[PDB]
Design a protein around this nucleic acid. Structure first.
Ligand code: MG
Lengths: 558, 429, 225, 211
DNA sequence: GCATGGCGCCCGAACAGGGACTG
DNA sequence: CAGTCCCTGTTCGGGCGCC
């Protein structure tokens, strides 16, 4: 049955024209095969026979499913799609069980011949044209055009969605107290009705789509929990993620890793804390795709802990409106973090992990900030409400952070959970120059044409230094100076640079970076017990500047 | 089909396609609201449903105005507004009230609905398409598009400009002292009468409007404590410039000398009459910081002299209505913030310091937005243009809650910056 | 130049309504911040808040009496009214209508008050008082100071004008505030003169009761036995 | 229904002095308190609004302050007008509310109640009734106390009282007190006593008689 | 001669704009 | 200043995972 639904109009990308791609000859076997199926479709109204004026054609071959050993008509719409206008895709994120509310009665449906059931814009079909070659050099093949959403066509997905949506609209407004989670050609219908009045509704709904071309085959879940929805299993009281059979092969190649890491992520949603950053870097660097790769032990450690968690199965819970939401953050390895969003004591709604390190020179409040930031959004999307947080960071630590940081920032309502490893700033510059410490005057330079330069200080007492550097640039060196002074000095000291660059980098209270130099300059700061840096406009002639300037201006041109 | 009037044609800047922006997550409260206010908009047919076939888009969200406790849909037509512009700035630009700034009390009317009564160009409609999110992604997005002049689109006021100049003609000839300016969804009305009379004269303009179809929002004044509604008016007087000042110590440590050398140095870019040599000499060789220094009669000579130069308007500054506008905001600390509005670098057009609204809740985000808004508002009044903002915050954060604290019909263009405390250039004391 | 004057019936029968009027000048009830408020004050007790009428007509009522209160205005006549339904003795008090005004984001106060109206609930029927003298006895008279008294019993309604020797005497006089006895007013005054004067020089009690249009004098004749 | 409390009811001081009155709330009213002055006459004026701001045309010797739940008014150095009743009004949330007021009086060297009892005037008895007036005059302070005794036996029925305000001249108090009995009952006894217990004499000043 | 579309993740490359050096 | 280089941030491409 075809639908009485209006047909959504589609145009070709601006200025282009239909696809006119030659057909490849095929076997008498294949052809007489295609004819079987292509005929059937013609009878079912799915396609029609076009005239000779249609100049368009797209390739179409056939293939057999090793199982029954039957045949199928595969069409390579590759070129059409290159010429089909772009659609504003409407599907915007997959629904999650966490967002489901506990309903009395539940049903799950699936529509048959989804695509093959929605009409294709009359004025576009001609482009779906295709030839099914004749056995030999005889008369041209048989010409066919599509009448329904051709499978494999760009617009196909998005169009059938709107169709299913426009179709459901009447029914919803009729029973506004029944939820219909529609995703593609699949429907999760549920309600707090009795198994009778409900069933009497589901029916009322099947008839509707039926009356509208949407066949609801007998492959629907009724009184059959577990419900196989979106790759999960829905239990009246809880829900589980469909088993994950991770590849445990002997020989490991980069590609096979992606199939693991990915799945791992997929598991990261319900399985409390999962580390993958470990074997992640196994992919790093400009690699191949079939190239084999050695299983490091640092990485062999992730698999160990992971496979361990995946061993003992768990379960998530449905959402309860009234009872607000809580998100607990945890600190993990360097860069990794974890969270459990829940409502009751230990009833996880969903869990996950944050790993992305924004920028190079970062620290740990930042990451937590970022962690919360992301968690919020992810909640807004699932429950449309902002969650209450429990974070490994003491009010004190926070209060100092922002009140100092020149960048505005904040975190929503939260409490502090005492449970290390805790998060705190490891060091802290001084507000006023300290007394009882040499006031080092760092600097540095380099030549772009040479890749070389020097960099060192000039204390107020007279002390000096001027280590030479190869392959580095100003920013490197002026950053370098500040390193010396943090080795060649006491547990207290003053410093002075002409680079905001290095200066800023430091003030930000970095607690980790990408470069070692700065990771080391970080290590000095945490080691000492009192630092303070000031800035001065280089090339201005200010006090103890000229000294180091000249002292490092050996090679300032040519 | 709201009006007989002939639709005026709009064609986006050449070689640029319509807006294709994605729809950001929305919280129930806003959705529920956005849905309702959209439904009833479709009924009267100001808007129309549409599907995948329309490849453009724009984001929307809504804000429960505190001004009137009534939600207001908000479409971020910034891209589109950008994509179309010979239209509103050139072809049909709306002149600026030199003196709107010179008034003592000025109020803003959300004359938004005045637009729902003009047919929008037949073709130009695909461009205003927008979508509505679905909690937990229960169902696809609900898309729509405009049929009449849309709210918050630089084009509207320009198109409506005519039917608006007329509506005001009477009221203006029977109240010459008042000044009226329109910037997109708003009407800037400012008077010189007592606040009590203004308050009235405004509430009187409201009528003249209603006597013409233009329904304006209903502001609420509460009798309970914080009489927030007392601020509704704007006063272009407590609008004082914020010059820089050089510290004042009795004994200047080394440290303290450099600071002042830097600042005096930076400022030199602003005003050229800043000399530092005779004052920096005091720091001639590699010495400790904490070391006191006696200001020379040749030094303290120009210190207190340079400062004399930091108390007046810059080196002949001019505002070119043809150029864009920029504004910077630096988190000064303890709720205080500062800003400079310039068209060209170091040729500031205005400097000031947004103090703080007692409802800051110790929230920089919240404060910043308010500062943006505030700053913005001033700009519209003063030059009648919105400045591009260099927002002292991390995108990822600002994008997470700028809406929650937002309360404006419009939205300014912004960017991010992680530029540390150069020098206390813009003074904190 | 701002002023308000409460108007009223000053005396109401139990379970009947009364409508106070606040005629003001110096400000309009149209100007944004303005409003009028009605404060009450029973005989002797402290201040109470009745209700406040605002320019926007977002009037607020004392939760304890919303059922019997009702505020309103007549912006053009600069009057403000307050109606009370089904009154009770407990409602007898002095009512003030004060000009309330919200000045700024933080200041809102009753800037100017009226003098108030004396409304009293009493089924009582306007009756004149009966005067009785007070002369000491069985403790005859001292070569010192003597205190003569006067008694004004059972009159309605307040007030009474009492003086000694038609105004002649006034230094050691004490006229006490009245009290209710069987829903009827009663009060006394006590004048004190040196013995060297009384009886020698007559002493009389001057009692006046406007309401009943009565005036009466009582001669303080010394005690017989 | 935000209860405003002024614990200090009757407070006496002297010219030149400096006083502070307390107005407590029931919840943080964020400095939304006002101060009112009600003179013995009856007029009510506005002293301070917003717990610390002075109303135009008000003596600079006036200031009050407080925060959250505790607020107090402090009159600089007394003048002869200041001696009056004071009220604080909370406007942080309707219903509005005032304290219980604080009467500001004037300290005067204590003095004893000059008592005086009286027989039921003939005329009164002529009509069929009998009252027994008893004036307690010009005493200080106000805290006094009367006691009625008929033939040694105490009586409570018919005992009415009346207290006057501080006399603005000699700063004292007076207090009439009447015993209202029927005629026949008056003629059914002989001794009627008025006992005034003041903070002066350990012994109740008595004055009495017998028909 | 092998889906179409969506979201997530991990990585690396091209790209953009601001500050600094060189002649 | 004009012409280039450093450096950091952002966007977009590729592969996998899930639907
Ligand atoms: Mg340098």
């Amino acid at each position: 049955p075809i639908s009485p639904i209006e047909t959504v109009p589609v145009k070709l990308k601006p200025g282009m024209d239909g696809p006119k791609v030659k057909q490849w000859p095929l076997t008498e076997e294949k052809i007489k095969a295609l004819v079987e199926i292509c005929t059937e479709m013609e009878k079912e109204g799915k396609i029609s026979k076009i005239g000779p004026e249609n100049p368009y054609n797209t390739p179409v071959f056939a293939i057999k499913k090793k199982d029954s050993t039957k045949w199928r008509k595969l069409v390579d719409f590759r070129e059409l799609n290159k010429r089909t206008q772009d659609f504003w895709e409407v599907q915007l994120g997959i629904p999650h069980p966490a967002g489901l509310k506990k309903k009395k009665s539940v049903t799950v449906l699936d529509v048959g011949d989804a695509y093959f059931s929605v009409p294709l814009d009359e004025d576009f079909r001609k482009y779906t044209a295709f030839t099914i070659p004749s056995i030999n050099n005889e008369t041209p093949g048989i010409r066919y055009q599509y009448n329904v959403l051709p499978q494999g066509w760009k617009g196909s997905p998005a169009i059938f969605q709107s169709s299913m949506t426009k179709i459901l609209e009447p029914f919803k407004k009729q029973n506004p107290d029944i939820v219909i989670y529609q995703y593609m050609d699949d429907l999760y219908v549920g309600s707090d009705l009795e198994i009778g009045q409900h069933r009497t509704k589901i029916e009322e709904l099947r008839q509707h789509l039926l009356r509208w071309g949407l066949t609801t085959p007998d492959k629907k879940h009724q009184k059959e929990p577990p419900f196989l929805w979106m790759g999960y299993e829905l239990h009246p009281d809880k829900w589980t993620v469909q088993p994950i059979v991770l590849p445990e092969k002997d020989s490991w190649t980069v590609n096979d890793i992606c199939k693991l890491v990915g799945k791992l992520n997929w598991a990261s949603q319900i399985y409390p804390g999962i580390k993958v950053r470990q074997l992640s870097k196994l992919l790093r660097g400009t690699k191949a795709l079939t190239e084999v790769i050695p299983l490091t032990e640092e990485a062999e450690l992730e698999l160990a802990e992971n496979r361990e968690i995946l061993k003992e199965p768990v379960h998530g819970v449905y959402y309860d409106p009234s009872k607000d939401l809580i998100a607990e953050i945890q600190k993990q390895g360097q860069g990794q973090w974890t969270y459990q969003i829940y409502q009751e004591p230990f009833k996880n709604l969903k869990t996950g992990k944050y790993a992305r390190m924004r920028g190079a020179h970062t620290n740990d409040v930042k990451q937590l900030t970022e962690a919360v930031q992301k968690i919020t959004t992810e909640s807004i999307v699932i429950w449309g409400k902002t969650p209450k947080f429990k974070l490994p960071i003491q009010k004190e630590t926070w209060e100092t952070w922002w009140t100092e940081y020149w960048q505005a920032t904040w975190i929503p309502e939260w409490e502090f959970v005492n449970t290390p490893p805790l998060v705190k700033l490891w060091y802290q510059l001084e507000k006023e120059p300290i007394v009882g410490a040499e006031t080092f005057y760092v600097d540095g330079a380099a030549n772009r044409e040479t890749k070389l330069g020097k960099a060192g200080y000039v204390t107020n007492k007279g002390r000096q230094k001027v280590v030479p550097l190869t392959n580095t640039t100003n920013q490197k060196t002026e950053l370098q100076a500040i390193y010396l002074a943090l080795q060649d000095s006491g547990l207290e000291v003053n410093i002075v640079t002409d680079s905001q660059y290095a200066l800023g980098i430091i003030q930000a209270q970095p607690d980790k970076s990408e470069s070692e130099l700065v990771n080391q300059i970080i290590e000095q700061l945490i080691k000492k017990e009192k630092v303070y840096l000031a800035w001065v406009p280089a090339h201005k002639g200010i006090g103890g500047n000229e000294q180091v300037d000249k002292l490092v201006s050996a090679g300032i041109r040519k | 089909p709201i009006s007989p009037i002939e639709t005026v044609p709009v064609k986006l800047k050449p070689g640029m396609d319509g807006p294709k922006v994605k729809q950001w997550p929305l919280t129930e409260e806003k959705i529920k609201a956005l849905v309702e206010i959209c439904t009833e908009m479709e009924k009267e047919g100001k808007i129309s449903k549409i599907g995948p076939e329309n490849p453009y888009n724009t984001p929307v969200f809504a804000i429960k105005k505190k001004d009137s406790t009534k939600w207001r849909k908000l479409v971020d037509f910034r891209e589109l507004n950008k994509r179309t512009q010979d239209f509103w700035e050139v072809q049909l630009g709306i002149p600026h009230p030199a003196g709107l700034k010179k008034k003592k009390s000025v109020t803003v009317l959300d004359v938004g609905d005045a637009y729902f009564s003009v047919p929008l160009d037949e073709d130009f409609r695909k461009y205003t398409a927008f979508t509505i999110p679905s909690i937990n992604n229960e169902t696809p997005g609900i898309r729509y598009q405009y049929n009449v002049l849309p709210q918050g689109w630089k084009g509207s006021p320009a198109i409506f400009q005519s039917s608006m100049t007329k509506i005001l003609e009477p009221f203006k000839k029977q109240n010459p002292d008042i000044v009226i300016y329109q910037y997109m969804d708003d009407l800037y009305v400012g008077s010189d009468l007592e606040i009590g009379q203004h308050r009235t004269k405004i509430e009187e303009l409201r009528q003249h409007l209603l006597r013409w179809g233009l329904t304006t929002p209903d502001k609420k004044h509460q009798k309970e404590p914080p009489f927030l509604w007392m601020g509704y008016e704007l006063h272009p007087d407590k609008w004082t410039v914020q010059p820089i000042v050089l510290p004042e110590k009795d004994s200047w440590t080394v440290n303290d000398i450099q600071k002042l050398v830097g600042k005096l140095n930076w400022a030199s870019q602003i005003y050229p009459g800043i000399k530092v040599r005779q004052l920096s000499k005091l720091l001639r060789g590699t010495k400790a910081l904490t070391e006191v220094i006696p200001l020379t009669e040749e030094a303290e000579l120009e210190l207190a002299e340079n400062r004399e130069i930091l108390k007046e308007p810059v080196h002949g500054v001019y505002y070119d209505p043809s150029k864009d506008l920029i504004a910077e905001i630096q988190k000064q600390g303890q709720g205080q913030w500062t800003y400079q509005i310039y068209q060209e670098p170091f040729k500031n057009l205005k400097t000031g310091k947004y103090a703080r609204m007692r409802g800051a809740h110790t929230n920089d985000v919240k404060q910043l937005t308010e500062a943006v808004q505030k700053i913005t508002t001033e700009s519209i009044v003063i030059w009648g243009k919105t400045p591009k903002f260099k927002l002292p915050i991390q995108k990822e954060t600002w994008e997470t809650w700028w809406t929650e604290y937002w309360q404006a019909t419009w939205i300014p263009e912004w960017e991010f910056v992680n530029t540390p405390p150069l020098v206390k250039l813009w003074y904190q004391l | 130049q701002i002023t308000l004057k409460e108007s009223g019936p000053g005396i109401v029968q139990p379970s009947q309504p009364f409508r106070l009027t606040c005629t003001f000048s110096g400000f309009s009830l149209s100007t944004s911040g303005i409003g009028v408020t009605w404060i009450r004050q029973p005989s002797g007790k402290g201040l109470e808040w009745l209700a406040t009428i605002w320019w926007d007509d977002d009037n607020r009522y004392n939760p304890s009496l919303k059922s019997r209160l009702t505020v309103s205005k007549d912006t053009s006549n600069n009057q403000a009214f307050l109606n009370m339904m089904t009154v009770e003795t407990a409602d007898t008090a002095i009512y003030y209508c004060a000009q309330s005004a919200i000045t700024s984001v933080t200041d809102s106060a009753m800037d100017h008050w009226g003098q108030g109206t004396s409304v009293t609930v009493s089924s009582a029927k306007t009756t004149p008082p009966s005067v009785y003298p007070l002369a000491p006895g069985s403790a005859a008279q001292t070569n010192s100071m003597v205190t003569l008294g006067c008694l004004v019993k059972g009159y309605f309604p307040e007030p009474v004008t009492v003086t000694w020797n038609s105004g002649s005497l006034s230094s050691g006089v004490h006229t006490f505030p009245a009290v209710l006895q069987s829903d009827l007013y009663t009060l006394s005054s006590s004048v004190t003169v040196p013995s060297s004067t009384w009886p020698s020089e007559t002493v009389t009690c001057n009692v006046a009761h406007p309401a009943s249009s009565t005036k009466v004098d009582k001669k303080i004749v010394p005690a017989d036995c | 229904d935000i209860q405003m409390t002024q614990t200090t009811s009757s407070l006496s001081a002297s010219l030149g002095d400096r006083v502070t009155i307390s107005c407590s709330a029931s919840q943080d009213i964020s400095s939304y308190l006002n101060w009112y002055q009600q003179k013995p006459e009856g007029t009510v004026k506005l002293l301070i609004y917003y717990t610390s701001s002075l109303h135009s045309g008000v003596p600079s010797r006036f200031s009050g302050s407080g925060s959250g739940t505790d607020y107090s008014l402090t009159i600089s150095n007394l003048e002869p007008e200041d001696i009056a009743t004071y009220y604080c009004q909370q406007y942080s949330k309707f219903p509005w509310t005032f304290g219980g007021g604080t009467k500001l009086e004037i300290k005067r060297a204590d003095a004893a109640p000059t008592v005086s009892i009286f027989p039921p005037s003939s005329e009164q008895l002529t009509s069929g009734g009998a009252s027994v007036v008893c004036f307690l005059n010009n005493f200080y302070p106000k805290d006094i106390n009367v006691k009625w005794k008929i033939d040694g036996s105490e009586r409570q029925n018919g005992v009415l009282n009346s207290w006057t305000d501080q006399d603005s001249k000699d700063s004292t108090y007076s207090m009439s007190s009447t015993l209202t009995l029927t005629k026949d009952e008056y003629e059914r006894h002989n001794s009627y006593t008025c006992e005034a217990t003041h903070k002066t004499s350990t012994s109740p000043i008595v004055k009495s008689f017998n028909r």
